[PDB]
Design a protein around this nucleic acid. Structure first.
Ligand SMILES: [Mg+2]
Ligand SMILES: [Zn+2]
Ligand SMILES: [Zn+2]
Lengths: 99, 78, 32, 149, 258, 59, 115, 66, 100, 49, 179, 59, 28, 446, 59, 179
RNA sequence: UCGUGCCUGGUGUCUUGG
C-alpha cells in the first residue's frame, strides 16, 4: 500500500482506486471515506462465505468506530481513551488502573 | 407539542404490563370487567386492550426534556 | 487350536479361487 | 348444468418427459371435436392408461346434475345423484392460472386453463370461447372415463 | 356398521410356540392382539427379594435382578391370583403371591452352579421351568461363599417390567406378497421370499391390488416357558376383551352422568 | 509382583491383566506420562526471521 | 431418580377418570374422548372399528405425549347419530369380534391336538 | 459377568444354555452348529451366546476364604 | 382477497393511484416536523421506500399488470402504512448490542 | 470482582441438565424434570383471587 | 457407538411399541439416519452389516482395517445365504399400528457403549442454597449446591433483549441483595 | 414425630411390599426412602407398618 | 519356504508372539 | 410455590452468541431427568442433544415474568434482526419427511388423513374434499399440507432439484418434476417442500407466515408441521443403509475409467515438468503451475466421479433424499461415500514431504503422484488403503485443530465488540446515541 | 517454576482407558499457543503414534 | 519361522528368536527416513512395471499404525477421520468391567456394566488389547430409522423391555475415606 | 407433669463435558 503515489499516476483512475488498509484510507481520504471503506472491507469478510448480515449492524459498528474523528479501535487503546467514564472503562480491561 | 412516536413500544408494553400486573397482585382496583380469571398478567393484558391501564409513560429525551404519554393516548402495537 | 486350523485352511482359498478376480469394490495403488 | 368443458381425448403420450414419479404420469392428449391440447396428471396406479386410449373428459363445477353448487367439504354419506356415477376417474381441484394470447389492443383467441387437483396438475388448452367457463381460484372437478369404442 | 367375522387356522402347535392364521379381521385388531401378547397378558414372576446372606462375587441387586427374569409356570394359577396391589393382606397372601426360597452354601472344593434348582417354591405348581435341558444359572459360588434369600412371586404383566412378558418373540406378518404395496421395494427381486409367500420362483412381488384390505395375519407366538404358547393367546384375547368391557363400563357411567 | 503366576496374582487379590507401569502413592495409582522433547546432541537449523538472524543453528 | 414408577401406565390415580367425553364446538356432532391410562393398544382398535361405521364422518386417535399415559379419540357422525353411540357401538361389536375369535381359536386348538 | 437370563431383544431364556454351549464346544462343533443345536433361531438370541464373555470364572479366583 | 380476476377491465381511476400514492407518502413519517431541515431529512430517510412505492404503484402497472380494483387499492394503501409503522425502530432498543 | 462477581454473577432460581429432543412440545415450551420443578420456586403474591 | 456416533437416550419404548421384523426382533436401539450422511461413518453400516452375518453364521466377524478380502459385496453375498436382504435392509412393521413401514429399515447387530456421562450426575437445580463467605453470591459446583453463572455473554444477550428488569434481577435480586 | 428413622413396609396401594426408612413424617403422611429404587416417596402414614430391626438375647 | 501366500494367517502369529514377549506397557 | 406447568422460564445454551441464544419458554413438567425441547428450537441454540446441557433461569417477580413474556418468548424470536430471516426452521427428519410428504405421488386414505388431522392444532375440524374421489377416495400430500399452512399466505419458491432451464421452456406453470412451489390463499398448489421453502432463508414459507400472520399463528405452524409430519413418517419411514451406498456396477466402471484417465493425465504433467516443457503459466513459478495443473486434474476427476455418483442414484435412495430435502448432508457427501474421497489438504496444499522428499516411507524420493501426496481414490464404502488412511487423518486433523483455536480467538473479538457498543441505543428522539448522549446515527440504520 | 501434570492419576474407568493412559505421550509446548505446527499430524508419526487418538479439547 | 512360532509354548521359541535370527528389526523413526518400505509381503514385491524394486523392509500388519483405543474400531477405514478420533476419545468413557479384582478395589469412582459383551465384529488387534476378556459395551440390535422423532438429532431410542432385562444396566461405585 | 434448633472450608492444579 502507498495510495497517494498511486492515485497521482497518469492513466490511473483517481476515482475508483481503493486501498484495503483502512488506516491508509484515514490518512489519505479522511474519516468519511474510512467509514465507507471500512464497511466495504467488513462486508467483504462477511459475505465471502455466502452468508448475509443486515446493513444496520455494519453501519452501526462503522459509525461507532468513526464517531470521534480519529479511527477508534475496539481495544483498550481505543474504547478506554474515549471519555466515557470510569465505571464503564473498568469493566472491560485495565480494571484497577482506570479506577 | 409532543414529538415522540404515537405507538406503544415493545419495551413500554413489557414493563407497563409487568408493572400493572404487580399492582394487580397487590390488590389494586381493576379498571376492567373480570370475566372470571385470576392471573395478574391476564388481567393486565385485558386492561391493556381496553386502554384502561391507569399509567402514564414518562419518556426522557436526550437533551433532558421529557414527554408524558397516557396509556390510552398512544397506539398499542400487539 | 481350531482357530489355527481354521485360519490356515481358510486363507489358502485366496490361492485356490484363481478363476474370478473380477469384482469391483476394492482398490490399490500402482505408482510410476 | 355447470359443465365448464367437455370433449373426448386420446392419450398421445403417457409420460414423454420420462416417468418422474411412480404412481403418477403426465398424460399428453388432444381432443377429438374442439381440438384442444391437454396435459393431465392421473393416478396411474389406481387408474392405468396406455397410449391410444380414448376418454370422455367432462370438467365440471359441481358433481350434482341440478347444479346446486356444493360447498367444498368431504361428505361420503350423500343420497343425491352425482355426475361421478357415470365416470371412472373423478378429481377435485382449483384453477390456479389462466393464461392466453392477449395483445395490447385486441382480445385472446386461445386460453390455457391450469388446474391443480391437490398437486396433480392439468393444463387444458385451446379456443378461448370453449374455455369461457373458467375463472381463476374457482373450484373444479375432472370426471373422466375411458372409451372402449 | 358392525363387526367382521374372523377365522383361525393353527399351522403349528408345540410346547414352545404356536403358529396360527387369522382371517377376515382389521389390521388394527390383528396388531393390538400382538401388543397384548407382549405387554398385557399376566404371568407370575419373582418381584420381591429379601436377601439374608449374600457372599457371592456379584452384587445384591444382581442376584435379585436375575431372580426376577426367571420364568415361572403360570397357566393353572395366574388367572386365580389377585394382583399384589389388590390383595387385602398387610404383607403377602397365597391368594396374591407365591413364596420362594434359596439356601445355598458351597462347602465342597469344586465350584457351585447356583441354578433354578435351588429356588424352592411353597406352591407345587408355580415353579421355575424344570418339569420335563439344563437350568438357569443364577451364580457360581467358591469354597466358602453362600447365598441365602427368600423371594416372592406376584402377578404382573409386561407393561411394568419385561419380566412379566410371556413371549420369546411374536412373529406378526400380513400380506406376504407385496399385494397392498404397504412397503415399496427399490429393487423387488433382491428380496427373499416370505415363509408364507403364495408365489412362484419367477415373479418377485404380487401384482398391485388396488381395492383391498389386509387379512390373513400370520402369527408365531413363542413361549418363554412361563405359559403354554397357546395359553398366551387365549389369555391375550381375554385381556383385550376385558380392557374393552372395563372401558365400556366407564363409558356408560360417563354417558348417563352427563 | 514379578515373574509371578496367575494363581499367585489371584491369591494376592491382584489382577493378572493389570499391565503395570504405574506407581502407588498414598494409595493412588499414578502414571508418568511420557513427556516429549527435542533430541539431545543433534544439530538443527531453523529460520527465526523475526530477529537479527536469517538462520539459527541449534544444539 | 425422577423416573415414573412403571405402574403409572395402567393404574388410575385417585380422582382421575377412565374416560371423559367433551363435546367439540368447531363442527356439529363432534366429541373428544379422553382415555386415561391407555395407549396405542386400546386406541387403535377403537379407531379402526369406527371407520367401519357408515354413519361416521370422522374418527381418529392421538397420544398427546408418549411420557403421559393418555389418549384422545375424536368422533364425528351424521346428525342422526351421536358420537356417544358411535363409540359405544365400536366397543360393543369389537368385544363381539374378540369373543368370537376367542371361541374360534379354542376349537381350533382342540382340533389340532389329536385331530 | 455371567450369561444373561434372557435375550435382551426378544426375551427368550438363554440362561440355561451357556454350560450346554461350552459342552457343545468340548465336542468339535463350529459355534454356528452349537447355537443351532441349542435351538437359537433368531439373530438376537444367537448374539447372547456368541458375545457373552464369562468373567465370573475370573472373579471366582479371588477366594474369600480357602 | 378481493378476487381480482385479472381478465376483466378494472374500475380504478388512473388518477386515484397517482394521488393515493401522494397521500400515502405523507403518512410514512420517520423524521417528524414541518421545518425545512426536518422535511428534507424526512424526505431523505424515506427515499428508497418511496421510490419503490412509486415504482410498483404506477398507473400503468396498476392497469396492465395488477388489475387492482378500487376497493383493493384502498385496502392496499392502508396495509402499506400499517406495515411500515410496525417496522419503525422501537425507542429503548439496544442496537449496539445487536450490532455486536 | 468486576468480571467474576459483578458483570457476571452466580444466580439463584436456576437449573441445568442434559437436553433430549421432544417433538411433542410447542416451539415455545421447555419440558422440565419433576425435581427441577420441585426445587425452584416462584414468589407469588397472595390475593383474594 | 464404535464409530463416533455419540447420542443421548431420547425416549424409551417397550417391546409392544418398537418396530419389528417378520419375526419379533425389535431393535434394541434406534438411531436417526441423519447421523450418517454428514458424518460419513460408513464403518458403522458395515459393522451393522457384518454383525448380522456374524450372528447368523454363528462365528465372530473380522473388521481389521486394511484387509481387502473383506468388502461389502462379499459380506452381502454371505448375508443373502441366511435369508436376509443382501444389503442389510429389512421390512419393519410399525409397533403402534402394525402396518408395514414403506421404507425398508437398515437393521442389524452393532456394538454400543454406555458412556460415564449419566444424566443423574449432571442434573442440578438451586433456590437459596449456600453462599460464598467472601462475596455473598451462590457457590460454584453441583456438589457444593452451587448456582449457575449468569456470565457476561448472558448479560449481553439480555441487554440486546432490552430485558433490563430481568437483567437487574439476575444481576442483583437473585444473586447478592444488599443495603 | 416418633417413627422418623425407623424401618417401615408399605402395606397398601401401588407400592405394596416395598421396604423403606422414614426420612420425615407429619400428622397424616410420611416420606420413605425405598430400599430398592433410587427414590424417596411421600405416602399416607396409614399405608405403613413398622418392621423394626433388632436382635434378642444380648448375652 | 520363502513364498507363503498364507500371509493374513502368518502375519498375526508374529503379532501374537510380539505381544506374548513384550506386553503393552513394556516401554514403561 | 414450586415451578409448575405453564410457568415462564428463560432458557440458554452456552456459549451465548446472539440474542436468540436465550429465549423465554413455557414450562411443562415431565417424568425423567432431562430438559426437553421442540427441535426447531435447536437451530437458534445451536444445540445437539449429543450430550449437550442447557441452563434454565426462572424469573422471580411479576415484573420480570411479564418482561420475558413480551420481549423474549420463543415465537417472538423467529426472525433475527441480524439477517432479517427466520432463525428457526424445519431441520431434521421432519424436513426429510416433508419433502417426501409433498411429492406428487403421495396419496392417503381416509384412515390416514383423519389420523393426521388429529395432529393439527389450527384445524377448523372439516375434512377437505379429497383430490381423487373415484375409483377410491384419496387425498394428497399437498392437500393435507394445505391445512397446516395458516391463514391466507401467498408465496413462490423453488425446490432444490429445480432445473434452471425450466422457466424458459414450456411447462413453466406446470412443472414435470413438481419443482416450483406455489402457495396461494394459504394452500399448497404445486411443488415439493424442502430447506429452500421451509428452512431458514429470507422469504421461506415460515418467514412469510411470520410477516403475514402473527407470531402466535406462526408458533402453531412450526408445531403442526412437526406433529403431522412426524406422524406421517410412522407410515412412510426413513432410514439409511448399505444399499443406499452401492452404485450399479456400470458406475463402478465409469469411476475406475475416470480415475485411470486422471492418473494418466498427471503422468504427462509430470513428464512435461520432468523434461522441462511445462512453461510457467503466467503469474507463477514452475513449481506452482505444476501444482495447479495437478489439482485441476484431480478436482476435475473428483467432480466428474461425483456427478456419475449422483446420476446413478435411484429416486428411492436415502442419501439423495436427505440431500435434496436439505435435511442433512451435501452432494459431495454422496460423492465421498460412493465414488471418491478426494484430495487431502493440510494448509491448503497437498500432503507435505514429511520424510525426506517423500510423504511416507512406502513411497519413493520425489513422488508427486496422486497416491503419494494425499489423493484418496477409494470411497468410504470400499475402504481406504493404509497409506490413504493416514493421509485422511492428516487432513481431518486440520479441522480439529482449527476448531480448538477458533473458539479462543473469536470469543474475545465478540467481547470487545459488545464492550465498545453496549450503551448504544435508540432514544425517544428516534436518534442513535451512546452513554455520553453523543449522537451516533441520526436515524437507526440511516 | 517446574513442569506440571507429568504424574497423573491412572484412569480406572475401563480396561481400554487403563491401557491407553499407560501409553500416553504429552507435548511440553505451552497452551495459549496460536501456533498449529505442533498440533498437526506429521507424516512421520506413521506406525509410532496413533493417528486417531487425541483429545478434542484445547490439547 | 512361522512353523516354530506357531508351535510356541509347546516349545520354548518366541519373538526374540525372530530378532536373533535376523528376520525382524526394530526401526527408529529417524532410521525409517532411509528404508524403502513395502506394505504387504506379496503385493508390493511382485513383478510389474517397476515402482522401486529395491524394498528393504516390510510392514508387519498395516493396522499396527493404530493405538489402543483406535484399534477397537471395526472398519476404521470406512469412517471420516474425525469420527475415529471421537471414538478414540469416547472409548475411554465406555463402561465395562474396569479390572478383574474390582470388588477388592476401593477406587473413588468406578462403573461396572452388568452384562458386558465381546464385540460381534472385532479387529484382529483387539485380541492383544485383551478386549475380549474385559469388554466395554453390548452388541445391540440397532435399527437406523426416523422412528417417531425422539432420536432426531444425535439422540437414540432405546428398548425399555431390553433395559428391564438388564441391557446396559450398571453399578456406579462411589467410595469415601476418613481418618 | 414436659418446650432447645442453619450449621457448613479457603487455595491450586490435571482429566474430562457441549
Ligand atoms: Mg453437542
Ligand atoms: Zn395378598
Ligand atoms: Zn434373542
Amino acid at each position: 500500500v502507498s495510495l497517494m503515489r498511486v492515485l497521482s499516476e497518469k492513466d490511473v483512475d483517481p476515482v475508483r482506486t481503493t486501498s484495503n488498509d483502512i488506516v491508509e484510507i484515514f490518512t489519505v481520504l479522511g474519516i468519511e471515506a474510512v467509514r465507507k471503506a471500512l464497511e466495504r472491507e467488513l462486508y467483504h469478510v462477511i459475505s465471502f462465505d455466502g452468508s448475509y448480515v443486515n446493513y444496520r449492524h455494519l453501519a452501526l459498528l462503522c459509525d461507532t468506530m468513526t464517531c470521534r474523528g480519529h479511527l477508534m479501535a475496539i481495544t483498550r487503546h481505543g474504547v478506554n481513551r474515549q471519555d466515557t467514564g470510569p465505571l464503564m472503562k473498568c469493566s472491560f480491561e485495565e480494571t484497577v488502573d482506570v479506577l | 407539542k409532543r414529538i415522540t412516536t404515537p405507538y406503544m413500544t415493545k419495551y413500554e408494553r413489557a414493563r407497563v404490563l409487568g408493572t400493572r400486573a404487580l399492582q394487580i397482585a397487590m390488590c389494586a382496583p381493576v379498571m376492567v370487567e373480570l370475566e372470571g380469571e385470576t392471573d395478574p398478567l391476564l388481567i393486565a393484558m385485558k386492561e391493556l386492550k381496553a386502554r384502561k391501564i391507569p399509567i402514564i409513560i414518562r419518556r426522557y429525551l436526550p437533551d433532558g426534556s421529557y414527554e408524558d404519554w397516557g396509556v390510552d393516548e398512544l397506539i398499542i402495537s400487539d | 487350536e481350531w482357530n489355527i486350523v481354521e485360519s490356515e485352511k481358510a486363507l489358502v482359498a485366496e490361492s485356490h479361487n484363481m478363476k474370478n478376480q473380477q469384482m469391483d469394490p476394492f482398490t490399490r495403488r500402482q505408482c510410476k | 348444468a355447470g359443465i365448464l368443458f367437455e370433449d373426448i381425448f386420446d392419450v398421445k403420450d403417457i409420460d414423454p418427459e420420462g416417468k418422474k414419479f411412480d404412481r403418477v404420469s403426465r398424460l399428453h392428449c388432444e381432443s377429438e371435436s374442439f381440438k384442444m391440447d391437454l396435459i393431465l396428471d392421473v393416478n396411474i396406479q389406481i387408474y392405468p392408461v396406455d397410449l391410444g386410449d380414448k376418454f370422455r373428459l367432462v370438467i365440471a363445477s359441481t358433481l350434482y346434475e341440478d347444479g346446486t353448487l356444493d360447498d367444498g367439504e368431504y361428505n361420503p354419506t350423500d343420497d343425491r345423484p352425482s355426475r361421478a356415477d357415470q365416470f371412472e376417474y373423478v378429481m377435485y381441484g382449483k384453477v390456479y392460472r389462466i393464461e392466453g394470447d392477449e395483445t395490447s389492443t385486441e382480445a385472446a383467441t386461445r386460453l390455457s386453463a391450469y388446474v391443480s387437483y391437490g398437486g396433480l396438475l392439468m393444463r387444458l388448452q385451446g379456443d378461448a370461447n370453449n374455455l369461457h367457463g373458467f375463472e381463476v381460484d374457482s373450484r373444479v372437478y375432472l370426471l373422466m372415463k375411458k372409451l372402449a369404442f | 356398521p358392525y363387526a367382521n367375522q374372523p377365522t383361525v387356522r393353527i399351522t403349528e402347535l408345540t410346547d414352545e410356540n404356536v403358529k396360527f392364521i387369522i382371517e377376515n379381521t382389521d389390521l388394527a385388531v390383528a396388531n393390538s392382539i400382538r401388543r397384548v401378547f407382549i405387554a398385557e397378558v399376566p404371568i407370575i414372576a419373582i418381584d420381591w427379594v429379601q436377601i439374608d446372606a449374600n457372599s457371592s462375587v456379584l452384587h445384591d441387586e444382581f442376584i435379585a435382578h436375575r431372580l426376577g427374569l426367571i420364568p415361572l409356570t403360570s397357566d393353572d394359577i395366574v388367572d386365580k391370583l389377585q394382583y399384589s396391589r389388590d390383595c387385602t393382606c398387610e404383607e403377602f397372601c397365597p391368594e396374591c403371591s407365591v413364596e420362594f426360597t434359596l439356601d445355598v452354601r458351597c462347602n465342597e472344593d469344586q465350584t457351585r452352579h447356583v441354578t433354578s434348582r435351588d429356588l424352592i417354591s411353597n406352591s407345587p405348581r408355580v415353579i421355575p421351568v424344570t418339569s420335563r435341558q439344563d437350568d438357569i444359572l443364577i451364580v457360581k459360588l467358591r469354597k466358602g461363599q453362600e447365598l441365602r434369600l427368600r423371594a416372592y412371586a406376584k402377578k404382573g404383566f409386561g407393561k411394568e417390567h419385561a419380566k412379566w412378558n410371556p413371549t420369546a418373540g411374536v412373529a406378526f406378518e400380513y400380506d406376504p406378497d407385496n399385494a397392498l404395496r404397504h412397503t415399496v421395494y427399490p429393487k423387488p427381486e433382491e428380496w427373499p421370499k416370505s415363509e408364507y409367500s403364495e408365489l412362484d420362483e419367477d415373479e418377485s412381488q404380487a401384482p398391485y391390488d388396488p381395492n383391498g384390505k389386509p387379512e390373513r395375519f400370520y402369527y408365531n407366538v413363542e413361549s418363554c416357558g412361563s405359559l403354554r404358547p397357546e395359553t398366551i393367546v387365549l389369555s391375550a384375547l381375554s385381556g383385550l376383551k376385558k380392557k374393552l368391557s372395563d372401558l365400556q363400563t366407564q363409558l356408560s357411567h360417563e354417558i348417563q352422568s352427563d | 509382583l514379578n515373574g509371578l503366576t496367575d494363581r499367585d496374582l489371584c491369591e494376592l487379590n491382584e489382577c493378572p491383566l493389570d499391565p503395570g507401569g504405574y506407581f502407588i502413592i498414598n494409595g493412588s495409582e499414578k502414571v508418568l506420562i511420557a513427556q516429549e522433547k527435542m533430541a539431545t546432541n543433534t544439530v538443527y537449523v531453523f529460520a527465526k526471521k523475526d530477529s537479527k538472524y536469517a538462520y539459527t543453528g541449534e544444539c | 431418580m425422577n423416573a415414573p414408577p412403571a405402574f403409572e401406565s395402567f393404574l388410575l390415580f385417585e380422582g382421575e377418570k377412565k374416560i371423559t367425553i367433551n363435546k367439540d364446538t368447531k363442527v356439529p356432532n363432534a366429541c373428544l374422548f379422553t382415555i386415561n391410562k391407555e395407549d396405542h393398544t386400546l386406541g387403535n382398535i377403537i379407531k379402526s372399528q369406527l371407520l367401519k361405521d357408515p354413519q361416521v364422518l370422522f374418527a381418529g386417535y392421538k397420544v398427546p405425549h408418549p411420557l403421559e399415559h393418555k389418549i384422545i379419540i375424536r368422533v364425528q357422525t351424521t346428525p342422526d347419530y351421536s358420537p356417544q353411540e358411535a363409540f359405544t357401538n365400536a366397543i360393543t361389536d369389537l368385544i363381539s369380534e374378540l369373543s368370537l375369535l376367542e371361541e374360534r381359536f379354542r376349537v381350533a386348538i382342540k382340533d389340532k391336538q389329536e385331530g | 459377568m455371567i450369561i444373561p437370563v434372557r435375550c435382551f431383544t426378544c426375551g427368550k431364556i438363554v440362561g440355561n444354555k451357556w454350560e450346554a454351549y461350552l459342552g457343545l464346544l468340548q465336542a468339535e462343533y463350529t459355534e454356528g452348529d452349537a447355537l443351532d443345536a441349542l435351538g437359537l433361531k433368531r439373530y438376537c438370541c444367537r448374539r447372547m451366546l456368541l458375545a457373552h464373555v464369562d468373567l465370573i470364572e475370573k472373579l471366582l479366583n479371588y477366594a474369600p476364604l480357602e | 382477497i378481493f378476487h381480482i380476476n385479472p381478465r376483466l377491465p378494472s374500475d380504478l381511476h388512473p388518477i386515484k393511484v397517482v394521488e393515493g400514492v401522494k397521500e400515502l407518502s405523507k403518512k410514512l413519517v420517520i423524521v417528524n416536523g414541518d421545518d425545512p431541515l426536518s422535511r428534507q431529512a424526512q424526505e431523505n430517510a424515506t427515499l428508497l421506500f418511496n421510490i419503490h412505492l412509486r415504482s410498483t404503484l404506477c398507473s400503468r402497472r396498476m392497469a396492465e399488470e395488477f388489475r387492482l380494483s378500487g376497493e383493493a387499492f384502498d385496502w392496499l394503501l392502508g396495509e402499506i402504512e400499517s406495515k411500515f409503522n410496525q417496522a419503525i425502530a422501537h425507542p429503548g432498543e439496544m442496537v449496539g448490542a445487536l450490532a455486536a | 470482582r468486576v468480571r467474576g462477581n459483578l458483570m457476571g454473577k452466580r444466580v439463584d432460581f436456576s437449573a441445568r441438565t442434559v437436553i433430549t429432543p421432544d417433538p411433542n412440545l410447542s416451539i415455545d415450551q421447555v419440558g422440565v424434570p419433576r425435581s427441577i420443578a420441585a426445587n425452584m420456586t416462584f414468589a407469588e403474591i397472595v390475593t383474594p383471587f | 457407538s464404535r464409530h463416533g456416533q455419540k447420542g443421548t437416550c431420547g425416549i424409551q419404548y417397550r417391546q409392544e411399541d418398537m418396530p419389528f421384523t417378520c419375526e419379533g426382533i425389535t431393535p434394541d436401539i434406534i438411531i436417526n439416519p441423519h447421523a450418517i450422511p454428514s458424518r460419513m461413518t460408513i464403518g458403522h453400516l458395515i459393522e451393522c452389516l457384518q454383525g448380522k452375518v456374524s450372528a447368523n453364521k454363528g462365528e465372530i466377524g473380522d473388521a481389521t482395517p486394511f484387509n481387502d478380502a473383506v468388502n461389502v459385496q462379499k459380506i452381502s453375498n454371505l448375508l443373502s445365504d441366511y435369508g436376509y436382504h443382501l444389503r442389510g435392509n429389512e421390512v419393519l412393521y410399525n409397533g403402534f399400528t402394525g402396518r408395514k413401514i414403506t421404507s425398508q429399515i437398515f437393521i442389524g447387530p452393532t456394538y454400543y457403549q454406555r458412556l460415564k456421562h449419566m444424566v443423574d450426575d449432571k442434573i442440578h437445580s438451586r433456590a437459596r442454597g449456600p453462599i460464598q463467605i467472601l462475596n455473598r453470591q451462590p457457590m460454584e459446583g453441583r456438589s457444593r449446591d452451587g448456582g449457575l453463572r449468569f456470565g457476561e455473554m448472558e448479560r449481553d444477550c439480555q441487554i440486546a433483549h432490552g430485558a433490563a428488569q430481568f437483567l437487574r434481577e439476575r444481576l442483583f435480586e437473585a444473586s447478592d441483595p444488599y443495603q | 414425630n416418633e417413627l422418623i428413622g425407623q424401618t417401615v413396609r408399605i402395606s397398601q396401594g401401588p407400592y405394596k411390599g416395598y421396604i423403606g426408612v422414614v426420612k420425615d413424617a407429619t400428622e397424616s403422611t410420611a416420606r420413605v426412602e425405598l430400599h430398592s429404587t433410587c427414590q424417596t416417596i411421600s405416602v399416607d402414614r396409614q399405608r405403613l407398618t413398622t418392621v423394626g430391626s433388632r436382635r434378642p438375647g444380648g448375652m | 519356504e520363502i513364498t507363503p501366500d498364507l500371509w493374513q494367517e502368518a502375519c498375526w502369529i508374529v503379532i501374537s508372539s510380539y505381544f506374548d514377549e513384550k506386553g503393552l506397557v513394556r516401554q514403561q | 410455590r414450586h415451578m409448575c406447568d405453564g410457568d415462564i422460564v428463560i432458557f440458554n445454551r452456552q456459549p451465548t452468541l446472539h440474542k436468540m441464544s436465550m429465549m423465554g419458554h413455557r414450562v411443562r413438567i415431565l417424568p425423567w431427568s432431562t430438559f426437553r425441547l421442540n427441535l426447531s428450537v435447536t437451530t437458534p441454540y445451536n444445540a445437539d442433544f449429543d450430550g449437550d446441557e442447557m441452563n434454565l433461569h426462572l424469573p422471580q417477580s411479576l415484573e420480570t415474568r411479564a418482561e420475558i413474556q413480551e420481549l423474549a418468548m420463543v415465537p417472538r424470536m423467529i426472525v433475527t434482526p441480524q439477517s432479517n430471516r427466520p432463525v428457526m426452521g424445519i431441520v431434521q427428519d421432519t424436513l426429510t419427511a416433508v419433502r417426501k410428504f409433498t411429492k406428487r405421488d403421495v396419496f392417503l386414505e381416509r384412515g390416514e388423513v383423519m389420523n393426521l388431522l388429529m395432529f393439527l392444532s389450527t384445524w377448523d375440524g372439516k375434512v377437505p374434499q379429497p383430490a381423487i374421489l373415484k375409483p377410491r377416495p384419496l387425498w394428497t400430500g399437498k392437500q393435507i399440507f394445505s391445512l397446516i399452512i395458516p391463514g391466507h399466505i401467498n408465496c413462490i419458491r423453488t425446490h432444490s432439484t429445480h432445473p434452471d432451464d425450466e422457466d424458459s421452456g414450456p411447462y413453466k406453470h406446470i412443472s414435470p418434476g413438481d419443482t416450483k412451489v406455489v402457495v396461494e390463499n394459504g394452500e399448497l398448489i404445486m411443488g415439493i417442500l424442502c430447506k429452500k421453502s421451509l428452512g431458514t432463508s429470507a422469504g421461506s414459507l415460515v418467514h412469510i407466515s411470520y410477516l403475514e400472520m402473527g407470531h402466535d399463528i406462526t408458533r402453531l405452524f412450526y408445531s403442526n408441521i412437526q406433529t403431522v409430519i412426524n406422524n406421517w413418517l410412522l407410515i412412510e419411514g426413513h432410514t439409511i443403509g448399505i444399499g443406499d451406498s452401492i452404485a450399479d456396477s456400470k458406475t463402478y466402471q465409469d469411476i475406475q475409467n475416470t480415475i485411470k484417465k486422471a492418473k494418466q493425465d498427471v503422468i504427462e504433467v509430470i513428464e512435461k515438468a520432468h523434461n522441462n516443457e511445462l512453461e510457467p503459466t503466467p503469474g507463477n513459478t514452475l513449481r506452482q503451475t505444476f501444482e495447479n495443473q495437478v489439482n485441476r486434474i484431480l478436482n476435475d476427476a473428483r467432480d466428474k466421479t461425483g456427478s456419475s455418483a449422483q446420476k446413478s442414484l435411484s429416486e428411492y435412495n436415502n442419501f439423495k433424499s436427505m440431500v435434496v430435502s436439505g435435511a442433512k448432508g451435501s452432494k459431495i457427501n454422496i460423492s465421498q461415500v460412493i465414488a471418491v474421497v478426494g484430495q487431502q489438504n493440510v494448509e491448503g496444499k497437498r500432503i507435505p514431504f514429511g520424510f525426506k522428499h517423500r510423504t511416507l516411507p512406502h513411497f519413493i524420493k520425489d513422488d508427486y503422484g496422486p497416491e503419494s501426496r494425499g489423493f484418496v481414490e477409494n470411497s468410504y464404502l470400499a475402504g481406504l488403503t493404509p497409506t490413504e488412511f493416514f493421509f485422511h487423518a492428516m487432513g481431518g486433523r486440520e479441522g480439529l485443530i482449527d476448531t480448538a483455536v477458533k473458539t479462543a480467538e473469536t470469543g474475545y473479538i465478540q467481547r470487545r465488540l459488545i464492550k465498545s457498543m453496549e450503551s448504544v441505543m435508540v432514544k425517544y428522539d428516534a436518534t442513535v446515541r451512546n452513554s455520553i448522549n453523543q449522537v451516533v446515527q441520526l436515524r437507526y440504520g440511516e | 517454576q517446574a513442569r506440571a501434570g507429568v504424574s497423573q492419576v491412572l484412569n480406572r474407568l475401563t480396561f481400554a482407558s487403563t491401557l491407553s493412559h499407560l501409553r500416553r505421550l504429552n507435548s511440553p509446548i505451552g497452551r495459549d499457543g496460536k501456533l498449529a505446527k505442533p498440533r498437526q499430524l506429521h507424516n512421520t508419526l506413521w506406525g509410532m503414534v496413533c493417528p486417531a487418538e487425541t483429545p478434542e479439547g484445547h490439547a | 519361522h512361522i512353523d516354530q512360532l506357531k508351535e510356541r509354548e509347546y516349545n520354548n521359541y518366541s519373538w526374540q528368536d525372530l530378532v536373533a535370527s535376523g528376520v525382524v528389526e526394530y526401526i527408529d523413526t529417524l532410521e525409517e527416513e532411509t528404508v524403502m518400505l513395502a506394505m504387504t509381503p506379496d503385493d508390493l514385491q511382485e513383478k510389474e512395471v517397476a515402482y522401486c524394486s529395491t524394498y528393504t523392509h516390510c510392514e508387519i500388519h498395516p493396522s499396527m499404525i493404530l493405538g489402543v483405543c483406535a484399534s477397537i474400531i471395526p472398519f476404521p477405514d470406512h469412517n471420516q477421520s474425525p469420527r475415529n478420533t471421537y471414538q478414540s476419545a469416547m472409548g475411554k468413557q465406555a463402561m465395562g468391567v474396569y479390572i478383574t479384582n474390582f470388588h477388592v478395589r476401593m477406587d473413588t469412582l468406578a462403573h461396572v456394566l452388568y452384562y458386558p459383551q465381546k464385540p460381534l465384529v472385532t479387529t484382529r488387534s483387539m485380541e492383544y488389547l485383551r478386549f475380549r476378556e474385559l469388554p466395554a459395551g453390548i452388541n445391540s440390535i440397532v435399527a437406523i430409522a426416523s422412528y417417531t422423532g425422539y432420536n432426531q438429532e444425535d439422540s437414540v431410542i432405546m428398548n425399555r423391555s431390553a433395559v428391564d432385562r438388564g441391557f446396559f444396566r450398571s453399578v456406579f461405585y462411589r467410595s469415601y475415606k476418613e481418618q
